[PDB]
Ligand binder design. Structure first.
Ligand SMILES: CCCCCCCCOCCOCCOCCOCCO
Ligand SMILES: CCCCCCCCOCCOCCOCCOCCO
Ligand SMILES: CCCCCCCCOCCOCCOCCOCCO
Ligand SMILES: CCCCCCCCOCCOCCOCCOCCO
Ligand SMILES: CCCCCCCCOCCOCCOCCOCCO
Ligand code: NA
Ligand code: NA
Ligand code: NA
Ligand code: NA
Ligand code: NA
Ligand code: NA
Lengths: 331, 331, 331
């Protein structure tokens, strides 16, 4: 099968970095073309009861702040087997059970700079899409609850330049109109800032859809990290959104926040992020959306890592506001 | 739909750069695999009268002087809407209204080294295929007159490293067997040579097709550029071609030349390029052509920019002659 | 048409390099996703008797020791003409006549580090898949005899950075259940280690398939090399495999070895490699296989080139063992 998401976003960014040239560069209007082509298949092997499944999805063909061009396999790309009895196992490049919940519902609309890859923790809060990963997805037992479980090699291990690995698990529970989410991920042998780290991230969350037209999601994230030199860091974050859908319209208010990081017992002042976002979406077709979105990002003021050099965050480049329109079509 | 152009060229180059090792290096026989695969589609949204359109085109799969492999989106890749009433709007990566006329017909056959990206002017004479763009194509009003018009982000802005932008417009008028072309492009906030430039380019041209089998095109290009330190540059260029089409064959003669550059009123000596080109083409199928090509490029001898360092031109590598055989098939 | 090979390998590698961190980095468990998507077609031109053919095959989508993402055109990608009388000609990216035999049958299962790209000789033993190649494949005359013949530009030459080139020829003769193979390749103008090399490689081999289910292959590879400073190098290599195919299973035992490199008549001690490999295969479907494989690589302990710095070989990273299971699906 050929499949694709044709998706373009026109976005104006006004930056407030404290330098006018830096404000001018990062800022301006760009087109964020997240269109992608994928190939997929299912296949019943003659001599194996579980059905063979496979997918190869390409990258964004021209995202903003980046050059043109994507290859096949840049996004979720795997082989695997699936069964009605025990769910599906997948090998290759997938979302980690923890990341999947961070991305959806928790990173939309436009909350990703804070809640996705934002944050000041050292090491690796979690992995997002990772190659060399095996992920088991359980069925929806009793039409109520599901389990996601994965282990994989780390970013350096997949280039033969390290021994990092990671494991994660997530569970979902249906409670009438609500879904309770809980997820966990641990990263080991993470080499950065001249140390070897261990990360542990925990997430709990709720999403609800109700027949009156209101839907909401709410998540709490607690990320801990310990270095080989004995320093321990802790960071909190949360994300929530409110949506009222009436006819062909969806109103959404989104908010997320990273809180001040705690290092070895000290609160580092001004290491917190938060973003507030509003989005109005029009269901222009059963297979497409049009949308307008506004967001305000207030990022942290900086922090150094355990090598006495600045630690990169989504706040490095500066505070900014974004006004965007976009379209997404699925085939 | 899937579409593609299968295009292979066997080309011999004899260089005259003034160094024999480099003449041996750059010269020789190479294959120019300009093949590309694309996907495109249209869709009628239920709640939007204009027809939705999109295209994702890949790069040359193995061009000469480069490595193998191309990504999806390296070429014309966009979304847009269409109306029979007001034409079509496209957001994404498109040819600029001026570049389209520079490329076709004015760069064929093999005049591109001189007329396309050749030249000595500073800044950016024009953009060619440019990402982060909106381009409107008007209908052929009265089956005679059409407008092509676009505004877009610059090369640096699409990486968040500048605030360069550009606007462009082109118009075509049908006069019996003639089409009159006139185009313009202006680039602003272009950073190069330690300065910030503004470019303004103008083009006029005529192409004609006659029932006896004669066709020709002729273009005149005028590029001026102003740097922030007050230096002003001006350069003229021209391109013309003559073809006699008889039966399954087309004979072609091409010429293009860039003239000496003018900086602050001073003519820079020997900064002019020109190419004479001959091509025989065989219509091997309604969907394919074979061609043979001979081409002679005489390039400028060099110029320094306003940073007292050499300015790169298509003449950097040296004068050269080229003999080509090739095939192009459309599906 | 679209075609593909969906191929994933889970492999544990135990290195024995003489450094513990290097054993930690290079070794471990990884996923080797050698999946690829391809496009190919044929066309009968109205005015040309031989049929036009073309192919664009993509790279490995997320191989081991590498990052994710592959372009269209990284593998066999060509245009060409084919006729029942005279076979087929191909221009573009293809395997050299010699390389095809080194790869198949002689590199399976897991003999590639030694017999494929392994060895200690200087210059370029052979090309494998190389762009800018014209390769002719003759018909199977009398269902007994076939020829493969190719000439091409070299790896530096395809970037406008050299004048290396190469030509090669191979032939196969079917004798009942045996096939006698002979191949040759000569590379010229190879710039490496501060000299200019000439390599000449010769190959002979036999393949057998018997009605009882036994198949075998065995090849003898002889590599010669001469540098511009007068140095002469010689290396011999060999590969063999034994197979029993019964029902849904095929057992494979493979061995290959490079012998000690001889430079200027003097044998360099411990410049020899060898690999032993066993693989058990399950034909899970007419279109797929599952397999388990174990292999042990013993590589040479080091070698200097003609610039007195280490010459890179397949052993530079260290000895290792590998245990892997995998799946392959064809569509
Ligand atoms: C029949 C139309 C001719 C079009 C103009 C030809 C241009 C010749 O000018 C040469 C300029 O140098
Ligand atoms: C019909 C077009 C006439 C072509 C004019 C060519 C003029 C060449 O001028 C050369 C000047 O030196
Ligand atoms: C039919 C188009 C005629 C244009 C030819 C241009 C004349 C070339 O002269 C340039 C200087 O040498
Ligand atoms: C100096 C000997 C000739 C060099 C031959 C190079 C041919 C490579 O091009 C392949 C053409 O198809
Ligand atoms: C016909 C079965 C092949 C058995 C392998 C014998 C290999 C002997 O190698 C000895 C090396 O010294
Ligand atoms: Na699940
Ligand atoms: Na090339
Ligand atoms: Na450009
Ligand atoms: Na137009
Ligand atoms: Na090569
Ligand atoms: Na053959």
């Amino acid at each position: 099968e050929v499949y694709g998401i044709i998706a373009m976003q026109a976005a104006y960014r006004d930056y407030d970095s404290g330098d006018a040239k830096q404000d001018d560069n990062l800022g301006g209007m760009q087109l964020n073309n997240e269109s992608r082509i994928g190939f997929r298949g299912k296949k019943q092997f003659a001599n194996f009861e579980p059905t063979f499944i496979w997918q190869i999805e390409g990258g964004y063909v021209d995202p903003s702040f980046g050059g043109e061009g994507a290859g096949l396999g840049e996004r979720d790309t795997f082989v695997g087997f699936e069964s009605a009895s025990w769910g599906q196992v997948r090998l290759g490049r997938v979302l980690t059970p923890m990341y999947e919940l961070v991305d959806w519902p928790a990173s939309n609309p436009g909350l990703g700079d804070v809640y996705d890859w934002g944050g000041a923790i050292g090491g690796a809060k979690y992995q997002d899409r990772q190659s060399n990963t095996i992920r088991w997805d359980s069925p929806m037992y009793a039409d109520k609850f599901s389990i996601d479980a994965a282990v994989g090699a780390g970013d350096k291990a997949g280039l033969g330049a390290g021994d990092d690995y990671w494991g994660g698990i997530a569970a979902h529970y249906k409670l009438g109109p609500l879904q309770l989410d809980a997820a966990y991920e641990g990263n080991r042998n993470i080499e950065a800032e001249g140390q070897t780290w261990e990360n542990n991230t925990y997430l709990v969350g709720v999403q609800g859809w109700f027949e009156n037209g209101i839907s909401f999601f709410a998540q709490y994230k607690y990320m801990e990290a310990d270095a080989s030199n004995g320093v321990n860091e802790k960071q909190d974050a949360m994300s929530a959104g409110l949506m009222y859908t009436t006819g062909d319209w969806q109103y959404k208010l989104g908010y997320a926040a990273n809180f001040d990081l705690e290092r070895d017992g000290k609160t580092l002042s001004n290491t917190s992020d938060d973003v507030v976002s509003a989005q109005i979406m029009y269901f222009v077709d059963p297979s497409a959306v049009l949308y307008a979105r506004a967001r305000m990002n207030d990022f942290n003021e900086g922090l150094d890592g355990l090598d006495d050099a600045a630690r990169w965050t989504s706040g490095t480049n500066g505070d900014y506001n974004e006004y965007s329109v976009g379209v997404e079509y699925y085939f």
